[PDB]
Write a protein that holds these residues in place. Structure first.
Motif, PDB file in Angstrom:
ATOM      1  N   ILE D 157      15.213  -4.439   1.231  1.00  0.00           N
ATOM      2  CA  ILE D 157      15.253  -3.075   1.485  1.00  0.00           C
ATOM      3  C   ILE D 157      16.182  -3.024   0.388  1.00  0.00           C
ATOM      4  CG2 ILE D 157      16.819  -1.121   1.779  1.00  0.00           C
ATOM      5  CD1 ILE D 157      17.716  -2.731   4.744  1.00  0.00           C
ATOM      6  N   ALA D 158      14.804  -1.456   0.229  1.00  0.00           N
ATOM      7  CA  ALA D 158      14.663  -0.849  -1.130  1.00  0.00           C
ATOM      8  C   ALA D 158      15.963  -0.770  -2.168  1.00  0.00           C
ATOM      9  CB  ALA D 158      13.267   0.238  -1.449  1.00  0.00           C
ATOM     10  N   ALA D 159      15.245  -0.378  -3.244  1.00  0.00           N
ATOM     11  CA  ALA D 159      17.016   0.387  -3.932  1.00  0.00           C
ATOM     12  C   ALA D 159      17.403   1.870  -3.878  1.00  0.00           C
ATOM     13  CB  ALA D 159      17.238  -0.341  -5.406  1.00  0.00           C
ATOM     14  N   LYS D 160      16.220   2.063  -3.357  1.00  0.00           N
ATOM     15  CA  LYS D 160      16.314   3.644  -3.852  1.00  0.00           C
ATOM     16  C   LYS D 160      17.016   4.226  -2.097  1.00  0.00           C
ATOM     17  CE  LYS D 160      11.066   3.232  -3.098  1.00  0.00           C
ATOM     18  NZ  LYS D 160      11.624   2.884  -1.287  1.00  0.00           N
ATOM     19  N   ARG D 161      16.672   3.616  -1.846  1.00  0.00           N
ATOM     20  CA  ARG D 161      16.731   3.797   0.210  1.00  0.00           C
ATOM     21  C   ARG D 161      18.452   3.827   0.308  1.00  0.00           C
ATOM     22  NH1 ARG D 161      13.160  -0.124   4.223  1.00  0.00           N
ATOM     23  NH2 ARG D 161      14.636   1.153   5.469  1.00  0.00           N
ATOM     24  N   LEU D 162      19.493   2.880  -0.622  1.00  0.00           N
ATOM     25  CA  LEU D 162      20.472   2.199   0.092  1.00  0.00           C
ATOM     26  C   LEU D 162      21.517   3.783  -1.371  1.00  0.00           C
ATOM     27  CD1 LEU D 162      20.268  -1.154   0.251  1.00  0.00           C
ATOM     28  CD2 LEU D 162      21.084   0.985   1.815  1.00  0.00           C
ATOM     29  N   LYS D 163      22.559   4.090  -0.406  1.00  0.00           N
ATOM     30  CA  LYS D 163      23.813   3.961  -0.989  1.00  0.00           C
ATOM     31  C   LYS D 163      24.655   4.106  -0.764  1.00  0.00           C
ATOM     32  CE  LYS D 163      25.955   8.693  -2.400  1.00  0.00           C
ATOM     33  NZ  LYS D 163      25.602   7.817  -3.531  1.00  0.00           N
ATOM     34  N   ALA D 164      25.485   4.090  -2.182  1.00  0.00           N
ATOM     35  CA  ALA D 164      27.490   3.403  -1.520  1.00  0.00           C
ATOM     36  C   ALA D 164      27.648   3.860  -1.326  1.00  0.00           C
ATOM     37  CB  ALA D 164      26.936   1.643  -1.971  1.00  0.00           C
ATOM     38  N   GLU D 165      29.297   3.795  -1.029  1.00  0.00           N
ATOM     39  CA  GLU D 165      30.700   4.912  -1.328  1.00  0.00           C
ATOM     40  C   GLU D 165      31.277   4.039  -0.409  1.00  0.00           C
ATOM     41  OE1 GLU D 165      27.349   7.758   0.378  1.00  0.00           O
ATOM     42  OE2 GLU D 165      28.686   8.933   1.348  1.00  0.00           O
ATOM     43  N   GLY D 166      32.690   3.946  -1.114  1.00  0.00           N
ATOM     44  CA  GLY D 166      33.755   4.045  -0.465  1.00  0.00           C
ATOM     45  C   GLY D 166      34.682   4.602  -0.237  1.00  0.00           C
ATOM     46  N   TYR D 167      35.468   5.632   0.689  1.00  0.00           N
ATOM     47  CA  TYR D 167      36.566   6.212   1.290  1.00  0.00           C
ATOM     48  C   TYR D 167      37.575   5.216   0.939  1.00  0.00           C
ATOM     49  CZ  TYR D 167      32.345   8.855   2.125  1.00  0.00           C
ATOM     50  OH  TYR D 167      30.640   9.387   1.937  1.00  0.00           O
ATOM     51  N   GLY D 168      38.838   6.153   1.118  1.00  0.00           N
ATOM     52  CA  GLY D 168      40.505   5.479   1.150  1.00  0.00           C
ATOM     53  C   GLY D 168      40.704   5.301   2.733  1.00  0.00           C
ATOM     54  N   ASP D 169      41.812   6.108   2.937  1.00  0.00           N
ATOM     55  CA  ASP D 169      42.436   6.441   4.595  1.00  0.00           C
ATOM     56  C   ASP D 169      41.806   8.163   4.801  1.00  0.00           C
ATOM     57  OD1 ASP D 169      44.203   7.435   2.552  1.00  0.00           O
ATOM     58  OD2 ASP D 169      45.255   6.986   3.730  1.00  0.00           O
ATOM     59  N   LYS D 170      40.721   8.161   4.068  1.00  0.00           N
ATOM     60  CA  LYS D 170      40.857   9.614   4.187  1.00  0.00           C
ATOM     61  C   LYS D 170      39.166   9.898   5.429  1.00  0.00           C
ATOM     62  CE  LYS D 170      40.033  11.199  -0.688  1.00  0.00           C
ATOM     63  NZ  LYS D 170      39.120   9.812  -1.134  1.00  0.00           N
ATOM     64  N   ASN D 171      38.465   9.203   5.389  1.00  0.00           N
ATOM     65  CA  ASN D 171      38.191   9.759   7.311  1.00  0.00           C
ATOM     66  C   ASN D 171      38.540   9.355   7.775  1.00  0.00           C
ATOM     67  OD1 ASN D 171      35.209  11.418   5.789  1.00  0.00           O
ATOM     68  ND2 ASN D 171      37.329  12.027   6.030  1.00  0.00           N
ATOM     69  N   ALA D 172      39.315   9.484   8.710  1.00  0.00           N
ATOM     70  CA  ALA D 172      39.961   7.876   9.729  1.00  0.00           C
ATOM     71  C   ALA D 172      39.655   8.303  11.505  1.00  0.00           C
ATOM     72  CB  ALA D 172      41.317   8.088  10.182  1.00  0.00           C
ATOM     73  N   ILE D 173      38.798   7.165  12.238  1.00  0.00           N
ATOM     74  CA  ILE D 173      38.280   7.009  13.264  1.00  0.00           C
ATOM     75  C   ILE D 173      39.705   7.091  14.609  1.00  0.00           C
ATOM     76  CG2 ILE D 173      35.834   7.456  13.333  1.00  0.00           C
ATOM     77  CD1 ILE D 173      36.709   4.392  13.988  1.00  0.00           C
ATOM     78  N   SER D 174      40.639   6.743  13.376  1.00  0.00           N
ATOM     79  CA  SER D 174      41.762   6.273  14.660  1.00  0.00           C
ATOM     80  C   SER D 174      43.282   6.838  13.904  1.00  0.00           C
ATOM     81  CB  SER D 174      41.714   5.021  15.249  1.00  0.00           C
ATOM     82  OG  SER D 174      40.784   4.394  16.005  1.00  0.00           O
TER      83      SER D 174
END
Lengths: 149, 76, 139, 193, 249, 71, 136, 149, 71
Positions: D157-174
């Motif tokens: 997968i090309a490098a431009k198509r990818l973005k990586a981001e890391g949230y802590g306990d911010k957005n919780a689905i539970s």
């Protein structure tokens, strides 16, 4: 009412596993209480790279079982390799190999308080036959320890 | 036995607490109670509280040597 | 079918209660660490007293829960550094418990020094290849 | 035929392997049944057709999603924004960015599914529970999300198509106050269009 | 035949009489269930022994002279309705549950969390509802063991949290440190027995909460923004991960 | 911004110092910047639409939530 | 075939326990880092190995008593002269060295360290003298 | 002596009704504890008017049963529609639609302390295919909630 | 020294007096001598390789363990 032997370790198992590893080609020697397991790097890693083959994990598993058969305080995992590019190159390669082997052995929990790691690159060979790469006799991983009591 | 696939039991080394087999190899088997065992699960009431206080019970209570009452051992 | 990703193994209520207590303890630890760092931020790093050097970059995965001196001696021996001790060892042992995985001997010695704190202090002289543990002048 | 650790990031050949085996068994059956070259050819053709239909089934997107659900990975399609939720508890070494290569079938299935959308923009977001420090959770989630993004990029997968981001306990689905909810909050989300 | 499992307890036997059967079945089931659950709790604690050592590390909280710091209990929004026409409220109360003392070994988590285990040997309205009621007793014993473990966890949490709270309050100068004095005798003794370096340590002042509120030190943390940092393309970007179930309230 | 299309992608430059032109606070997590009135209005519209507005610097995510503050 | 860690947290609650333990250890390490007071090597008030050849000789000492006696004996064994500058205290400065193989320089280092601020040891190698300087 | 489950809710029932709604075309998804019911506006309302057909009340009854299967604190009913006349026009239309659906769901008493309502008009579509009116994929009503404990 | 070959055999002369050129201590058992900077470096390399470096005089073994000391 009290255990009759160290849990999960048998003398017959130790002897059989030493025999099997020696038959395979991993040299398991024992002078005094000191034990040595010399693993050719060709049976663990790829060509001069710190990446174990997926097939070598069975070998690492038998070595982990052998280490678990004993009680010990500190194991030492050392790496040596043939000269390929530069002293720093082989030194970093051997340190990485020792790190990876020790990480897997640590994960496969052995009764070892400390598992030291080091790579001397091409400092101490055991054979004058230096021809070859990872197939060279003196390109190996040494797991040395002392049985505790 | 203990020193199986070795020669067999040579002698108990009381200094180390283990058996010594007919080769130079030690044995995994203990020979004295003072061998270093990795004892982690110990049975008995009032561990970590001085042991059971030796009194003739009037009720089902088991009282430890420091006054704490072992609820997990007392009668119900 | 309908599923959600983390289908782990069964858990016990003993572990659940221990986990809740551990999380509360960790929150209290975080609060006290923050308040104390704000009250007095550290000014000196112990990397001055334990300067790294070659052969101190050998790595080790330790799991130790005993007195400080034996672990420090084993670390020094594996580092090919002569081990020296200063001061009188106190009657009450300086117990330490290091549970790490695959970090260098200089880092482990730094961790040991930090855990010892006011009881003991580790120094490393790389010119003389000496690891020196000194017990403080209390008592 | 297939190296277990990611197949050296090389193209995978289930289709050709399956069709080859199917033509082999069909040719063997035809040779046994007839004893003639024409019969052997007919059997080989039957094996080829049956292998073709079997591979058409087994390489379908629906079968890939079913396999990912047999593994512990969830797939969600709302409109045309498709999301793969991968639990770090199973697909990462404990509290480390190190990928869990024992779960290589799941990661290979993720890559196969993502290969069906060559033009999509992929966002990889890392999430952790409430346990630990704020900075620790931020750094750990970021490292895990970046390791997943690097795996995607290495698998083709090309490098431009990818973005990586890391949230802590911010957005919780539970709910983090309960054990299983906190567990569900530990995940990596891969979103694409 | 086994008292260590509900299966064996039931297989042991494979209005007044009815009630007696119910009572005896509950009694036999409860003790066996409590013992078995205590055993499993101990097995779990031993499985997580190293993590518990890391969490409840009483050794790192030990003060300078091997003194266990006091346990401080805190409550907020305190109210007491003394009677009609009289209440007493307070913002925070701090109490010293246990005072600092000299120790020779740091406490461990086993003294609190360990559950004592001994395998208890013991033996229509006759062996038909007996299995039902012994299963009920087994569940009751499991619940009792869980309650005991919960109380033990609460006790260790109180002690460790009080020690941490003492450390925090000492940082904010809300408590005084323990003052220890050493009397340094020389070589002490007579012709029968001598001691070379005789020292007598004595806590001359125990720690105590100080009521001089002027001397307390507030502590204010902060979080780092883009201050003193910033091609510097500071941007609020929409292109990112967007939650599936977006408006959840 | 383009608010409908399908992915509502857009870009809001952030000025750190409180300029007279851009003096409206935005709290991107713990990192706060200043923007203009129209930018604040469109950010509030996106907040109503409940769209994540993570702060990106040089293509790198820094802080997740954006909430308008005192103007 | 690679196997998973035997101690791997694979329970919904065990994982949380293990992260809480990690966080507690991290917070304890940070607390210790803040608490610990260190002395930089430049500002260390301690004897530095005198490098004197006669003092580098190995020794074996088992002594628990006054500082003056052991320092004088060490100096005489090293062949240096010995002198004391200051007034001896009423209560003697008691030290304890129990070593089997340690050079006289390191033994003097330990003696000085155990003396602390009651007394100090200086070594002049050009004029080979060990000086025990008391403090008032 | 004590209830064994939340009254009137079954796991088999929840699974069956999720399957049935998904088969019908109402997308019922669950990520974590968060639940989403996306209803096409063409299956509830008339052509760009906030007036439900009498037939859609059976669908609203099934959705009310699904909501009653869970315990929760706050549901949210949001409405989106394709652009027809003006921004204010679709905003008012969507607010009215959310109001009406919320009123019916509230009347069919669900275990919900709060039922929030909003209509953003055409602010957040889920599909680039904007052709059509109420048949457009991004003209819908979302019922989102979180299962409580 | 020749450090790799197979047997890593080599020779380090020792000067008993602390000369300005050679003033780096080596403790060969209880018998200590002085060597140069390069000699100390290669001795430390051999110590890292964990090789016995016994002190031999006139072909006669005197004391086995060599450990570098203060420079």
């Amino acid at each position: 009412k009290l255990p009759c032997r160290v849990d999960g370790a048998c003398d017959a198992t130790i002897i059989k596993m030493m025999t099997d590893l020696n038959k395979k080609g991993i040299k398991v020697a024992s002078v005094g209480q000191n034990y040595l397991i010399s693993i050719p790097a060709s049976a663990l890693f790829a060509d001069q790279s710190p990446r174990l083959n997926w097939a070598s994990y069975s070998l690492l598993n038998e070595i982990a079982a052998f280490l678990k058969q004993f009680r010990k305080i500190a194991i030492t995992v050392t790496s040596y390799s043939s000269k390929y590019v530069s002293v720093k190159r082989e030194r970093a390669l051997t340190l990485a190999r020792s790190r990876v082997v020790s990480e897997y052995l640590w994960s496969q929990g052995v009764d070892s308080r400390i598992i030291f790691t080091q790579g001397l690159g091409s400092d101490k060979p055991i054979t004058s036959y230096t021809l070859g790469g990872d197939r060279s006799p003196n390109a190996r991983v040494e797991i040395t320890f002392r049985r505790a009591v | 036995g203990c020193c199986s696939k070795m020669g067999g039991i040579n002698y108990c080394d009381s200094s180390a607490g283990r058996l010594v087999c007919n080769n130079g190899f030690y044995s995994t088997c203990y020979c004295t109670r003072h061998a270093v065992m990795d004892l982690q699960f110990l049975m008995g009431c009032c561990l970590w509280h001085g042991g059971v206080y030796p009194q003739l019970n009037s009720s089902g209570l088991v009282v430890c040597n420091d006054g704490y009452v072992s609820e997990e051992c007392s009668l119900q | 079918k309908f599923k959600k990703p983390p289908i782990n193994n069964p858990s016990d209520d003993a572990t659940i209660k221990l986990a809740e207590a551990a999380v509360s303890v960790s929150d209290s630890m975080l609060e006290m660490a923050k308040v104390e760092k704000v009250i007095t931020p550290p000014s000196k790093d112990n990397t001055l007293t334990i300067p790294n050097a070659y052969n101190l970059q050998a790595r080790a995965s330790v799991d130790w829960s005993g007195p400080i001196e034996e672990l420090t001696a084993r670390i020094a021996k594996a580092a090919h550094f002569r081990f020296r001790v200063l001061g009188k060892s106190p009657s009450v042992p300086v117990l330490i418990s290091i549970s790490t995985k695959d970090e260098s001997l200089a880092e482990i010695l730094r961790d040991i020094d930090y855990q010892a704190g006011k009881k003991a202090s580790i120094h490393v002289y790389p010119n003389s290849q000496v690891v020196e543990l000194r017990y403080a002048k209390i008592y | 035929c297939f190296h277990p650790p990611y197949n050296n990031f090389q193209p995978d050949r289930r289709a050709v392997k399956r069709v080859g085996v199917d033509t082999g068994i069909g040719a063997v059956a035809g040779a046994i049944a007839s004893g003639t070259a024409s019969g052997t050819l007919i059997g080989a053709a039957a094996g080829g057709t049956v292998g073709l239909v079997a591979s058409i089934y087994r390489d379908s997107k629906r079968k890939i999603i079913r396999d990912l659900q047999k593994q512990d990975i969830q797939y969600v399609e709302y409109g045309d924004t498709r999301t793969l939720i991968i639990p770090t508890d199973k697909y990462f070494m404990f509290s480390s960015p190190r990928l869990n290569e024992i779960c290589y079938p799941g990661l290979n299935n993720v890559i196969r599914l993502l290969n069906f959308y060559p033009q999509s923009t992929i966002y990889v977001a890392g999430f952790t529970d409430n346990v630990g420090s704020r900075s620790h959770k931020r750094k750990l989630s970021q490292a895990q999300a970046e390791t997943m993004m690097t795996f995607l990029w290495a698998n083709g997968i090309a490098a431009k198509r990818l973005k990586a981001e890391g949230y802590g306990d911010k957005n919780a689905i539970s709910d983090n106050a309960i054990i299983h909810g906190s567990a569900q909050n530990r995940r990596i989300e891969i979103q694409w269009f | 035949g086994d008292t260590g499992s509900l299966a064996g307890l039931q297989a042991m036997a494979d209005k007044i009489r009815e009630m007696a059967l119910k009572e005896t079945a509950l009694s036999v089931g409860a003790q066996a269930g409590l013992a078995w659950r205590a055993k499993i709790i101990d097995e779990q604690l031993n499985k997580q022994a190293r993590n518990l050592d890391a969490i409840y590390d009483f050794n790192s909280l030990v003060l300078e002279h091997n003194i266990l710091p006091p346990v401080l209990l805190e409550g907020r929004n305190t109210l007491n309705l003394a009677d009609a026409q009289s209440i007493r409220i307070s913002d925070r109360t701090y109490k010293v549950a246990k005072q600092a003392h000299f120790i020779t070994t740091p406490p461990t988590w086993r003294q609190y969390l360990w559950m004592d285990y001994v395998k208890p040997e013991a033996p229509k309205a006759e062996k038909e509802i007996w299995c039902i009621y012994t299963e009920r007793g087994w569940k009751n014993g499991i619940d009792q063991a869980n309650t005991i473990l919960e109380e033990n966890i609460a006790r260790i949490k109180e002690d460790f949290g009080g020690m941490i709270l003492y450390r925090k309050l000492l940082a904010m100068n809300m408590v005084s440190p323990p003052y220890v004095s050493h009397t340094d005798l020389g070589v002490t003794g007579d012709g029968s027995e001598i001691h070379i370096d005789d020292r007598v340590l004595r806590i001359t002042a125990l720690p105590e909460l100080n009521v001089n509120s002027a001397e307390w030190r507030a502590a204010v943390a902060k979080d780092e923004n883009a201050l003193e940092r910033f091609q510097a393309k500071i941007v609020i970007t929409n292109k990112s991960w967007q939650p599936i179930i977006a408006p959840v309230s | 911004c383009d608010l409908t299309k399908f992915r509502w992608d857009c870009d809001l430059p952030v000025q750190v110092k409180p300029s007279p032109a851009s003096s409206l606070l935005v709290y991107c997590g713990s990192s706060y910047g200043y923007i203009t009135k129209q930018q604040y209005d469109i950010l509030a519209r996106y907040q109503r639409a409940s769209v994540n507005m993570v702060l990106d610097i040089n293509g790198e995510y820094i802080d997740s939530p954006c909430i308008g503050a005192e103007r």
